[PDB]
mmCIF file with all atom_site columns, C-alpha atoms in Angstrom:
data_model
loop_
_atom_site.group_PDB
_atom_site.id
_atom_site.type_symbol
_atom_site.label_atom_id
_atom_site.label_alt_id
_atom_site.label_comp_id
_atom_site.label_asym_id
_atom_site.label_entity_id
_atom_site.label_seq_id
_atom_site.pdbx_PDB_ins_code
_atom_site.Cartn_x
_atom_site.Cartn_y
_atom_site.Cartn_z
_atom_site.occupancy
_atom_site.B_iso_or_equiv
_atom_site.pdbx_formal_charge
_atom_site.auth_seq_id
_atom_site.auth_comp_id
_atom_site.auth_asym_id
_atom_site.auth_atom_id
_atom_site.pdbx_PDB_model_num
ATOM 1  C CA . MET A 1 1  ? 74.548 111.483 45.870 1.00 0.00 ? 20  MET A CA 1
ATOM 2  C CA . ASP A 1 2  ? 74.957 112.805 49.471 1.00 0.00 ? 21  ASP A CA 1
ATOM 3  C CA . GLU A 1 3  ? 72.904 115.902 50.559 1.00 0.00 ? 22  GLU A CA 1
ATOM 4  C CA . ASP A 1 4  ? 73.937 118.204 53.478 1.00 0.00 ? 23  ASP A CA 1
ATOM 5  C CA . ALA A 1 5  ? 72.480 120.299 56.340 1.00 0.00 ? 24  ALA A CA 1
ATOM 6  C CA . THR A 1 6  ? 74.555 123.153 57.945 1.00 0.00 ? 25  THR A CA 1
ATOM 7  C CA . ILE A 1 7  ? 73.693 124.253 61.523 1.00 0.00 ? 26  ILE A CA 1
ATOM 8  C CA . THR A 1 8  ? 75.064 127.819 61.939 1.00 0.00 ? 27  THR A CA 1
ATOM 9  C CA . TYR A 1 9  ? 74.780 129.558 65.354 1.00 0.00 ? 28  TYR A CA 1
ATOM 10 C CA . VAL A 1 10 ? 74.540 133.356 64.722 1.00 0.00 ? 29  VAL A CA 1
ATOM 11 C CA . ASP A 1 11 ? 74.385 136.366 67.094 1.00 0.00 ? 30  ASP A CA 1
ATOM 12 C CA . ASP A 1 12 ? 70.955 137.994 66.454 1.00 0.00 ? 31  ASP A CA 1
ATOM 13 C CA . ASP A 1 13 ? 72.095 140.882 68.803 1.00 0.00 ? 32  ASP A CA 1
ATOM 14 C CA . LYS A 1 14 ? 75.255 141.564 66.645 1.00 0.00 ? 33  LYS A CA 1
ATOM 15 C CA . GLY A 1 15 ? 73.608 141.638 63.145 1.00 0.00 ? 34  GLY A CA 1
ATOM 16 C CA . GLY A 1 16 ? 73.868 137.825 62.668 1.00 0.00 ? 35  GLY A CA 1
ATOM 17 C CA . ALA A 1 17 ? 77.671 137.520 63.431 1.00 0.00 ? 36  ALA A CA 1
ATOM 18 C CA . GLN A 1 18 ? 78.635 133.803 63.915 1.00 0.00 ? 37  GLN A CA 1
ATOM 19 C CA . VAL A 1 19 ? 78.681 132.261 67.477 1.00 0.00 ? 38  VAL A CA 1
ATOM 20 C CA . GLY A 1 20 ? 81.297 129.434 67.512 1.00 0.00 ? 39  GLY A CA 1
ATOM 21 C CA . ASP A 1 21 ? 81.244 127.466 64.191 1.00 0.00 ? 40  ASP A CA 1
ATOM 22 C CA . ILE A 1 22 ? 79.054 125.700 61.532 1.00 0.00 ? 41  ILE A CA 1
ATOM 23 C CA . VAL A 1 23 ? 77.937 122.075 62.294 1.00 0.00 ? 42  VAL A CA 1
ATOM 24 C CA . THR A 1 24 ? 78.271 120.255 58.895 1.00 0.00 ? 43  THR A CA 1
ATOM 25 C CA . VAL A 1 25 ? 76.122 117.051 58.905 1.00 0.00 ? 44  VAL A CA 1
ATOM 26 C CA . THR A 1 26 ? 75.482 114.944 55.708 1.00 0.00 ? 45  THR A CA 1
ATOM 27 C CA . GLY A 1 27 ? 73.261 111.975 54.728 1.00 0.00 ? 46  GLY A CA 1
ATOM 28 C CA . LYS A 1 28 ? 70.180 111.234 52.529 1.00 0.00 ? 47  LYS A CA 1
ATOM 29 C CA . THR A 1 29 ? 66.644 112.828 52.148 1.00 0.00 ? 48  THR A CA 1
ATOM 30 C CA . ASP A 1 30 ? 65.387 109.389 53.460 1.00 0.00 ? 49  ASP A CA 1
ATOM 31 C CA . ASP A 1 31 ? 67.258 110.113 56.775 1.00 0.00 ? 50  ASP A CA 1
ATOM 32 C CA . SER A 1 32 ? 66.122 112.657 59.440 1.00 0.00 ? 51  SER A CA 1
ATOM 33 C CA . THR A 1 33 ? 68.379 113.737 62.399 1.00 0.00 ? 52  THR A CA 1
ATOM 34 C CA . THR A 1 34 ? 67.540 115.095 65.928 1.00 0.00 ? 53  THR A CA 1
ATOM 35 C CA . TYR A 1 35 ? 69.923 117.934 67.097 1.00 0.00 ? 54  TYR A CA 1
ATOM 36 C CA . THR A 1 36 ? 70.000 119.499 70.629 1.00 0.00 ? 55  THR A CA 1
ATOM 37 C CA . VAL A 1 37 ? 70.659 123.311 70.632 1.00 0.00 ? 56  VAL A CA 1
ATOM 38 C CA . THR A 1 38 ? 73.731 124.328 72.743 1.00 0.00 ? 57  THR A CA 1
ATOM 39 C CA . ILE A 1 39 ? 73.400 127.661 74.675 1.00 0.00 ? 58  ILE A CA 1
ATOM 40 C CA . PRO A 1 40 ? 76.913 129.273 75.359 1.00 0.00 ? 59  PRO A CA 1
ATOM 41 C CA . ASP A 1 41 ? 77.976 131.802 78.126 1.00 0.00 ? 60  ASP A CA 1
ATOM 42 C CA . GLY A 1 42 ? 76.101 135.161 77.729 1.00 0.00 ? 61  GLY A CA 1
ATOM 43 C CA . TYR A 1 43 ? 73.930 134.149 74.670 1.00 0.00 ? 62  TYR A CA 1
ATOM 44 C CA . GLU A 1 44 ? 70.045 133.741 74.657 1.00 0.00 ? 63  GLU A CA 1
ATOM 45 C CA . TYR A 1 45 ? 67.908 131.400 72.376 1.00 0.00 ? 64  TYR A CA 1
ATOM 46 C CA . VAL A 1 46 ? 65.770 133.630 70.038 1.00 0.00 ? 65  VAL A CA 1
ATOM 47 C CA . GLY A 1 47 ? 64.593 131.118 67.372 1.00 0.00 ? 66  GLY A CA 1
ATOM 48 C CA . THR A 1 48 ? 65.437 128.521 64.643 1.00 0.00 ? 67  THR A CA 1
ATOM 49 C CA . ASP A 1 49 ? 64.598 128.377 60.864 1.00 0.00 ? 68  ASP A CA 1
ATOM 50 C CA . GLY A 1 50 ? 64.968 125.510 58.335 1.00 0.00 ? 69  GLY A CA 1
ATOM 51 C CA . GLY A 1 51 ? 65.139 122.156 60.209 1.00 0.00 ? 70  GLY A CA 1
ATOM 52 C CA . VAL A 1 52 ? 61.758 121.426 61.925 1.00 0.00 ? 71  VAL A CA 1
ATOM 53 C CA . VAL A 1 53 ? 62.096 122.876 65.497 1.00 0.00 ? 72  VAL A CA 1
ATOM 54 C CA . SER A 1 54 ? 60.430 121.080 68.508 1.00 0.00 ? 73  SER A CA 1
ATOM 55 C CA . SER A 1 55 ? 57.705 122.651 70.780 1.00 0.00 ? 74  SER A CA 1
ATOM 56 C CA . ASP A 1 56 ? 60.336 123.063 73.605 1.00 0.00 ? 75  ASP A CA 1
ATOM 57 C CA . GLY A 1 57 ? 62.807 124.777 71.134 1.00 0.00 ? 76  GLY A CA 1
ATOM 58 C CA . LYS A 1 58 ? 65.851 123.023 72.787 1.00 0.00 ? 77  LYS A CA 1
ATOM 59 C CA . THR A 1 59 ? 65.786 120.216 70.113 1.00 0.00 ? 78  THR A CA 1
ATOM 60 C CA . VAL A 1 60 ? 65.398 120.434 66.255 1.00 0.00 ? 79  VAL A CA 1
ATOM 61 C CA . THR A 1 61 ? 64.396 117.570 63.810 1.00 0.00 ? 80  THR A CA 1
ATOM 62 C CA . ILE A 1 62 ? 66.576 118.294 60.701 1.00 0.00 ? 81  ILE A CA 1
ATOM 63 C CA . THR A 1 63 ? 66.268 116.559 57.228 1.00 0.00 ? 82  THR A CA 1
ATOM 64 C CA . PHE A 1 64 ? 68.871 116.563 54.383 1.00 0.00 ? 83  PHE A CA 1
ATOM 65 C CA . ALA A 1 65 ? 67.901 118.210 51.008 1.00 0.00 ? 84  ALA A CA 1
ATOM 66 C CA . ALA A 1 66 ? 69.617 118.258 47.541 1.00 0.00 ? 85  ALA A CA 1
ATOM 67 C CA . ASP A 1 67 ? 67.249 121.194 46.669 1.00 0.00 ? 86  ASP A CA 1
ATOM 68 C CA . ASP A 1 68 ? 67.653 123.391 49.825 1.00 0.00 ? 87  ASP A CA 1
ATOM 69 C CA . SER A 1 69 ? 70.703 121.874 51.617 1.00 0.00 ? 88  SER A CA 1
ATOM 70 C CA . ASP A 1 70 ? 68.959 122.301 54.980 1.00 0.00 ? 89  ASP A CA 1
ATOM 71 C CA . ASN A 1 71 ? 70.589 125.515 56.330 1.00 0.00 ? 90  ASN A CA 1
ATOM 72 C CA . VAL A 1 72 ? 69.428 125.500 60.011 1.00 0.00 ? 91  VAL A CA 1
ATOM 73 C CA . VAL A 1 73 ? 69.925 129.048 61.473 1.00 0.00 ? 92  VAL A CA 1
ATOM 74 C CA . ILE A 1 74 ? 69.943 129.353 65.326 1.00 0.00 ? 93  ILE A CA 1
ATOM 75 C CA . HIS A 1 75 ? 69.598 133.052 66.394 1.00 0.00 ? 94  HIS A CA 1
ATOM 76 C CA . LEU A 1 76 ? 71.185 134.160 69.792 1.00 0.00 ? 95  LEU A CA 1
ATOM 77 C CA . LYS A 1 77 ? 71.134 137.577 71.684 1.00 0.00 ? 96  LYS A CA 1
ATOM 78 C CA . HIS A 1 78 ? 73.389 138.985 74.489 1.00 0.00 ? 97  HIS A CA 1
ATOM 79 C CA . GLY A 1 79 ? 72.116 138.509 78.099 1.00 0.00 ? 98  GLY A CA 1
ATOM 80 C CA . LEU A 1 80 ? 73.899 139.657 81.326 1.00 0.00 ? 99  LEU A CA 1
ATOM 81 C CA . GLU A 1 81 ? 77.724 139.099 81.306 1.00 0.00 ? 100 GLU A CA 1
ATOM 82 C CA . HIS A 1 82 ? 79.066 138.009 84.780 1.00 0.00 ? 101 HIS A CA 1
ATOM 83 C CA . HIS A 1 83 ? 82.747 138.566 83.593 1.00 0.00 ? 102 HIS A CA 1
ATOM 84 C CA . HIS A 1 84 ? 84.195 135.281 82.083 1.00 0.00 ? 103 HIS A CA 1
ATOM 85 C CA . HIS A 1 85 ? 85.148 133.332 78.857 1.00 0.00 ? 104 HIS A CA 1
ATOM 86 C CA . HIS A 1 86 ? 82.799 134.128 75.866 1.00 0.00 ? 105 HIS A CA 1
ATOM 87 C CA . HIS A 1 87 ? 81.933 131.230 73.437 1.00 0.00 ? 106 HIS A CA 1
#
């Protein structure tokens, strides 16, 4: 049996509306992964829940669960737009 962990970037400024797409990673409860958080144009790192977040916040140690399915939620707000491609 394979267990999953979904890393969903959401816009904490826009009522949790999705930024980009979901990162679907799978493995075993025995395995733990290290994921670097990607900050796109005009979006600000608020916080992360699920997946054990590092003291710097820019990396997150995730672990796969058949109970939870480790839904890692990365919250982002709107900063100052300098007129260009949103992502």
